[PDB]
Ligand binder design. Structure first.
Ligand SMILES: CN(C)c1ccc(C(=C2C=CC(=[N+](C)C)C=C2)c2ccccc2)cc1
Lengths: 186, 186
């Protein structure tokens, strides 16, 4: 495909190289497309990267549902969710491009005007595991929406900041956290 | 001193033009030094940066050594050390050039090794608080280095990926965590 081969090279590029490293034209380069082709299908290079994000945030979000069954209670759901984060082939990999990019276009408004959309689209997995855990009476989270953002960013931290050490340790550290956290809640 | 002048001019040059944008031609000329002199001391711009990053963390450890006097107990030290990390990373000038570096030499393993050695001096802070807490019995954690890494990573993730909120509410979020966390230990 045309437009489905652009995202195809852009994704990986942002990852390998970072947000700035990859260029509006460099993509058009390894994708064989016409510099113009971009404009009507993809507004700006930041719109394309803003696009790929929602795809990844989606791909993962689905893969998550299809697996979370293996977790019967939500307490397990919570552990499982965080565990799987470390291993998914989605979103999480291009997490520095996220950093680079928010600290680079943060002096504009098209940011929080298309960012928080993805933020909320993310802290949502935690929204449901907690709120559900209230219904199931697995605990009493009085400000769920908050706890969701904490948990999600504390977790995004453990995943992003340890990427380069033995995967069985990340999984160990991550479980010990999932624990301490759930624990401080009840 | 000539070694100092270089470190000095560079810290600025980076703060003002970022990492990739700064040439050693500049670090050399603006510090009335020698290109060979530079090579002898740091070999590369990468280290030159890693070296700044080290002098810096050194100060922070010390700025925090006189700051923890406001915290009687170790429960309090943990609350404050986290908040200090949140507040100061806000107006920290170099912050932008660290991100630049990190998401560039993230992949290189040569650099990635010296990094961790550095991410550790930042982790000892926790190490100490936790251990002391043990001795005074504020809590009874018995895998300090693990808890320490988990805390250092959850916290730095709240800092790094919460950016969008109004500073007043990020400081709100951080303490809620410090509490949930501190709770689940006990
Ligand atoms: C200005 N300031 C107080 C600080 C500035 C930076 C850090 C960081 C960091 C993240 C995880 C670490 N761990 C837990 C290994 C250690 C350091 C860090 C932040 C952004 C990109 C890479 C590393 C911490 C404090």
């Amino acid at each position: 495909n045309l437009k489905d081969k652009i995202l195809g090279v852009a994704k990986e590029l942002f990852i390998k190289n970072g947000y700035n490293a990859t260029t509006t034209g460099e993509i058009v380069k390894l994708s064989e497309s016409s510099k113009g082709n971009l404009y009507y299908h993809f507004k700006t290079k930041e719109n394309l990267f803003l696009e790929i994000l929602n795809i990844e945030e989606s791909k993962w979000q689905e893969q998550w549902k299809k697996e979370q069954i293996k977790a019967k209670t939500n307490r397990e759901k919570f552990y499982l969710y965080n565990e799987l984060s470390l291993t998914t082939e989605y979103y999480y990999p291009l997490q520095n491009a996220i950093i680079e990019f928010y600290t680079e276009y943060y002096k504009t408004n098209s940011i929080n005007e298309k960012m928080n959309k993805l933020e909320n689209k993310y802290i949502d997995a935690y929204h449901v595991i907690f709120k559900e855990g209230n219904l199931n009476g697995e605990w009493s989270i009085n400000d769920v929406n908050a706890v969701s953002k904490i948990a999600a960013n504390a977790v995004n931290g453990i995943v992003t900041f340890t990427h380069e050490q033995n995967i069985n340790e990340r999984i160990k550290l991550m479980n010990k956290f999932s624990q301490i956290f759930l624990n401080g809640l009840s």
